[PDB]
């Protein structure tokens, strides 16, 4: 007897059982006659060994993969990730990516086109519908020849928002249609920003509007299967301006505090969004005492500190408002000390490629990078947690898929791993709880398999 030694087997192969792969047997006398119905077991075994080789090959270097499930990818597929993103060839791969949406405005979704009419045709009171104003889009939209600035950008969404969403029927259509846009884009987690007091009426309090918005999204979420369901959380936008009426901020801040404990499950209010008029008169510290109640009840804060080309406003947002996320904020590099603080404290930067290109303008399709480029890759290289968003699905006329692909043209040489790293950043930056984060991470583990690699 020559013994070749015990064999431990393979960890996921020694658990297989006979019922899973039955062997049909015909009894001829005292001797069994066995046959195999198909080749399923070998296909299972070889698929396991195929995956086991991938994990061991990618085992050394797993810390550099934002999604650990990517270690089961073939080494050719992993080399594909490190290659620069192709805006025209990776349209299908980006479209199928489970995405995270952190900066999306409810009032800027169905601003023009067929979607504007679909919201209008479901008004509860068609006689109260405002006339459709003539708002012509700049030529080349969504990629204008020249940047249009912030004033012209907000005027492109004048057919929707407060004008249209005071109607309960229009508000319902806007919420359900926006969710349908999220599902079509394979968004797994979204945070929608709304201004419920802007849509309030004499008989409809801002609490009534917000409760309708939440239940419209909750009903949409419940009707969707768990596998492809987009979890929607709500941020309340506190809008600042030059005097006029700042009791609306107190109403929105109080509404978000009230809504925070009201809904502990499903769609829920998870933060406030300080936004509106950007100036040294309306800089962050002016509202520092308004947000003390927000901080006492554990509500997160994100700040629209991204147009006036200031860095002092970002300083108050980080340190006077305790903002967890910064909207836009394309001029962090102006203060290399503030850039270090943003990366060190984990403050996430919400980048909106199309909106930034349309409002500010950035060099496009340049083969080198310098002094004017979109700061996405510079922010990533500095350790900033960067997320990519749509800002306004309607005004910008682009989905989250289009915004991700535009970063290929905005930032030369951005890799497909870096796109995946922004989705991971957005999951970490989300104002989600443990149950929402766990559900979102299970979705992000399902990265689409690339086609036509090498």
């Amino acid at each position: 007897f020559v013994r070749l030694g015990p064999e431990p087997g393979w960890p996921q192969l020694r658990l297989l059982s006979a019922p899973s792969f039955p062997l049909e047997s015909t009894l001829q006398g005292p001797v069994h006659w066995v046959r195999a119905s198909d080749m399923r077991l070998r296909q299972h075994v070889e698929g396991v060994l195929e995956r086991s080789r991938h994990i061991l090959a990618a085992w050394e270097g797993i810390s550099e993969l934002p999604i650990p499930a990517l270690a089961a990818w073939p080494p050719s597929h992993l080399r594909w990730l490190h290659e620069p993103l192709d805006p025209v060839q990776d349209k299908a791969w980006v479209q199928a990516l489970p995405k995270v949406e952190l900066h999306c405005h409810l009032g800027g979704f169905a601003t023009h086109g067929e979607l504007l009419h679909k919201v209008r045709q479901e008004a509860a009171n068609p006689e109260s519908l405002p006339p459709v104003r003539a708002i012509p889009l700049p030529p080349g939209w969504p990629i204008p020849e020249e940047p249009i600035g912030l004033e012209r950008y907000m005027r492109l969404g004048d057919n929707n928002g407060s004008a249209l969403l005071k109607d309960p029927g229009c508000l319902r259509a806007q919420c359900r249609l926006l969710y349908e846009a999220l599902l079509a884009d394979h968004v797994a987690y979204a945070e929608i920003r709304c201004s419920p007091a802007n849509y309030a009426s004499a008989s409809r309090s801002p609490w009534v509007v917000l409760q309708e918005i939440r239940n419209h999204f909750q009903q949409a979420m419940e009707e969707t299967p768990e596998d492809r369901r987009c979890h929607v959380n709500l941020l309340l936008t506190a809008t600042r301006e030059e005097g006029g009426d700042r009791s609306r901020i107190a109403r929105h801040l109080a509404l978000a505090i009230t809504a925070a404990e009201h809904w502990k499950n499903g769609c829920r209010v998870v933060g406030v969004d300080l936004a509106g008029f950007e100036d040294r008169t309306t800089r962050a510290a002016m509202f520092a005492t308004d947000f003390e109640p927000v901080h006492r009840v554990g509500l997160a804060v994100t700040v629209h500190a991204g147009e006036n080309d200031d860095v002092e406003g970002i300083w108050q947002a980080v340190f006077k408002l305790s903002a967890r996320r910064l909207g836009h904020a394309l001029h962090l590099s102006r203060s290399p000390d503030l850039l270090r603080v943003v990366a060190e404290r984990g403050i996430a930067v919400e980048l909106c490629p199309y909106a930034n290109l349309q409002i500010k303008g950035f060099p496009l399709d340049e083969e080198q990078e310098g002094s004017e480029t979109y700061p996405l890759r510079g922010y990533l290289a500095a350790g900033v947690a960067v997320t990519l968003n749509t800002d306004n699905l309607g005004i910008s006329q682009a989905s989250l898929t289009d915004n991700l692909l535009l970063t290929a043209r905005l930032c030369p040489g951005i890799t497909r791993l870096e796109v995946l790293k922004t989705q991971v950043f957005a999951a970490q930056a989300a104002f989600a709880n443990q149950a929402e984060r766990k559900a979102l991470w299970a979705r992000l583990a399902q990265v689409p398999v690339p086609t036509d690699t090498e």
Binding site: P30, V31, H32, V34, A36
Partner: protein, 79 residues
């Protein structure tokens, strides 16, 4: 428990010799896989007669259907 799996060919005597690896204690049950070849058919009965006169462990001489001779790659994958 201790189960012995033994493939067999034109040399049926390997299975009774494989029975003696553990000594007098032997195996709690032994199972034999066989191909559908007619050349090795006589060895199947020789295994049966040995099992009858040495009983106590469970016996199986399960024969792989539609596998007569190893001709091409499909035969081995079927086995």
């Amino acid at each position: 428990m201790r189960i012995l799996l033994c493939s067999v060919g034109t040399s049926w005597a390997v299975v009774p010799e494989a029975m003696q690896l553990l000594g007098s204690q032997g195996f709690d049950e032994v199972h034999v896989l066989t191909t559908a070849s007619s050349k090795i058919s006589p060895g199947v009965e020789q295994l049966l007669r040995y099992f009858e006169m040495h009983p106590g462990p469970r016996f199986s001489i399960s024969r792989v259907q539609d596998f007569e001779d190893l001709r091409s790659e499909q035969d081995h994958m079927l086995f």
